[PDB]
Design a protein around this ligand. Sequence first.
Ligand SMILES: Cc1cc2c(cc1C)N(C[C@H](O)[C@H](O)[C@H](O)COP(=O)(O)O)c1[nH]c(=O)[nH]c(=O)c1N2
Ligand SMILES: Cc1cc2c(cc1C)N(C[C@H](O)[C@H](O)[C@H](O)COP(=O)(O)O)c1[nH]c(=O)[nH]c(=O)c1N2
Ligand SMILES: O=c1ccc2ccccc2o1
Ligand SMILES: O=c1ccc2ccccc2o1
Ligand SMILES: O=c1ccc2ccccc2o1
Ligand SMILES: O=c1ccc2ccccc2o1
Ligand SMILES: O=c1ccc2ccccc2o1
Ligand SMILES: O=c1ccc2ccccc2o1
Ligand SMILES: O=c1ccc2ccccc2o1
Ligand SMILES: O=c1ccc2ccccc2o1
Lengths: 359, 359
Amino acid sequence: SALFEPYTLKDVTLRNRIAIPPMCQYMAEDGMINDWHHVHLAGLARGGAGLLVVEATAVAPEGRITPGCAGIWSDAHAQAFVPVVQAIKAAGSVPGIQIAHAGRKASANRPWEGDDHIAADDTRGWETIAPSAIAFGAHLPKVPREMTLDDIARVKQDFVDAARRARDAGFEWIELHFAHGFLGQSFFSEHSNKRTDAYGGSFDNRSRFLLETLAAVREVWPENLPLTARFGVLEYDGRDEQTLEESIELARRFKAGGLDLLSVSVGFTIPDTNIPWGPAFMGPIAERVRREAKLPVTSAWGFGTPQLAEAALQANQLDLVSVGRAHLADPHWAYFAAKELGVEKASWTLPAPYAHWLE
Amino acid sequence: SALFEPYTLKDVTLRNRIAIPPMCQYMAEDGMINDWHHVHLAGLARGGAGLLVVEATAVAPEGRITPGCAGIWSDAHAQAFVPVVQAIKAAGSVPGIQIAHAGRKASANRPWEGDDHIAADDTRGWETIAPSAIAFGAHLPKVPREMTLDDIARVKQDFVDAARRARDAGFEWIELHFAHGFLGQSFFSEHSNKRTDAYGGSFDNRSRFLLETLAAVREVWPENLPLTARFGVLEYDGRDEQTLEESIELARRFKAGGLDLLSVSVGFTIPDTNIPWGPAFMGPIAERVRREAKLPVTSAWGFGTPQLAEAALQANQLDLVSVGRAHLADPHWAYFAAKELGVEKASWTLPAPYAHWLE
Ligand SMILES: Cc1cc2c(cc1C)N(C[C@H](O)[C@H](O)[C@H](O)COP(=O)(O)O)c1[nH]c(=O)[nH]c(=O)c1N2
Ligand SMILES: Cc1cc2c(cc1C)N(C[C@H](O)[C@H](O)[C@H](O)COP(=O)(O)O)c1[nH]c(=O)[nH]c(=O)c1N2
Ligand SMILES: O=c1ccc2ccccc2o1
Ligand SMILES: O=c1ccc2ccccc2o1
Ligand SMILES: O=c1ccc2ccccc2o1
Ligand SMILES: O=c1ccc2ccccc2o1
Ligand SMILES: O=c1ccc2ccccc2o1
Ligand SMILES: O=c1ccc2ccccc2o1
Ligand SMILES: O=c1ccc2ccccc2o1
Ligand SMILES: O=c1ccc2ccccc2o1
């Protein structure tokens, strides 16, 4: 089965092609993770996936999505990850982390607590920052503060510091969160970036924050560990062919700047869109990026059945298949997939205290 | 759904009728549990089951089954359970523990490391003890040492100390392991007990170790927390009607001695048997014990599908359904069962960071 073939990228070898993508848990306190995350992540690692990427972890307090988001903006925050990294490795999975800044989508309630921008008088909220003072709209009406050049320098340095901390906490894979309408995606998109300085206007200028952040992170992130990013390559906003072309050009520049793999996603930059949700819907788009940028890719958003995952790999649409919600439902999804695909000794996807009894 | 109705026993309320029975992990070191157990147990508790009973935990070093078995024979061993108990409670499940002594089946290899008695010259092994100097046979050929009266007193006191430690570690449910051919079961069975003192011969004498241990534990175990036992009520050895009758009489004596619930199992006292493995095969036997002893019961050994579990409850064969291997395969089995049985808001069997996305 293609799904169960190992994958090597730089010095890291994944035991199979199942990746658990970053999934926010909304359970941290002032950015500090706790035994929620420890058990959640260690349990997933034991389930058999080759790669486990920790949820969007804020590079700065104002870059959290919500008051429950994880952070890595101090050494104390980083040290909280050390035992979790060690548990993921003990289970034979590769520990990764997504480092993030939510931009104009920050200062929001948890999804089961309203999912909307926090009220002005709620003591939990904060001022958001963005390339331009324009609100997302809908349930996120807060107008962000337009960043100064010094803000841009500061946030870049926060990504560098976050990457350094991740490295020293023992992560073996990093993902820069340039997707989903958060700060990086919002610099790239003309919907959200109306700047007239070096960081807006032209393709080169809109790309600049992302490319400069990648280059700065590259200075501290080891060359022998995968350096990756998540990026929304289209919006489903009626501008798809032009946006895809620009996204592919940016992907080429990321590759030239040392990116090892791209997680291909949707922008979610604005609310007025028509995303065609369905099984494996991102497959053809991921394949086009893979082919036109000549870069390994993963994607998600409906690949969470064993046959869909296998088909995507065999068609060379993807190099890794990211499976999210199915792992919330069943942390041992990789074992389920091994059984479904008829892998020999499928139960040994799991550790011995489980595998022995399930054979 | 009957499976999702709460259950109250003494001062403890279970959120549903799904119990996770004790399942040895073989991952402890000199009896001390570690992050294997912490993550395993906390993850299961979060999966939604109402009751989680920790694996057979030895009351004394020689009462371990294997070198990987958990122990509770010192205060340091007990303290290792405290954070796990706290994690189980944080997840809304009730923490229980099975306290045990493997008797003649002790000093064995882990099941995936031979499953047989440890070789005489292996530095990991030890002398086993039992009511009589008679080997189990087959893959467990070691002849145990016949216990003295002082050994009997000592082992009883070890059960008392174990129960006291469990209480002080915060467990809310205790199960005395009098099943599966281990020390207690072997005192009851005429196959293994050939003693001619007060602890063998007659029904009263063969029952004596078990009843005395129950009474001694009762002196330290709080009256407001369930006091339970697991007991093999037949062997499938050609003596089933007579053995069942005696087992039911003993169950009546356990009830009179303060037992709140009986986990009805098979003896496994000797190898030469013909157990009719199959779906829910213990249902009729459990129902007979429940009715003839007038005691709540659980059982296991093939109830691990949602419809089988529901049927057993609706037929009043069982009060709780124990589901073992299905939980090794899928720690979120309770959520799977809720979905299968059409429970409203099935995803809220799980905690919010999972439930919200699965509705
Ligand atoms: C609970 C939860 C939380 C998050 C997500 C999703 C879910 C369900 N997603 C998106 C996620 O990585 C993935 O793309 C989607 O879940 C789609 O894949 P599936 O169809 O669920 O396999 C996500 N994406 C991301 O880049 N960073 C994140 O931290 C989060 N957080
Ligand atoms: C890995 C493992 C380890 C154990 C068990 C089983 C398994 C699979 N079983 C028996 C268990 O509680 C249960 O009765 C059986 O698994 C049958 O139920 P299922 O058909 O698996 O739901 C068990 N029983 C017991 O009384 N104490 C224990 O510690 C163990 N250990
Ligand atoms: O202590 C541990 C923790 C995790 C683990 C995972 C797989 C195999 C063995 C393990 O041991
Ligand atoms: O980047 C993100 C962060 C959170 C989140 C929650 C649900 C779906 C997608 C998401 O993406
Ligand atoms: O920030 C985000 C981005 C995407 C998304 C998709 C579905 C649900 C929630 C989401 O949140
Ligand atoms: O592909 C999808 C479709 C819906 C959805 C909702 C929440 C989170 C992730 C999701 O992914
Ligand atoms: O810290 C925690 C740990 C476990 C847990 C389980 C359910 C809900 C909330 C929880 O918080
Ligand atoms: O009491 C026990 C202890 C271990 C064990 C292992 C497999 C099956 C049943 C078992 O019962
Ligand atoms: O001690 C035991 C008792 C029962 C049993 C049943 C199946 C497999 C292993 C077992 O071990
Ligand atoms: O009902 C059963 C049947 C087989 C079996 C084997 C190992 C452990 C538990 C088991 O339960």
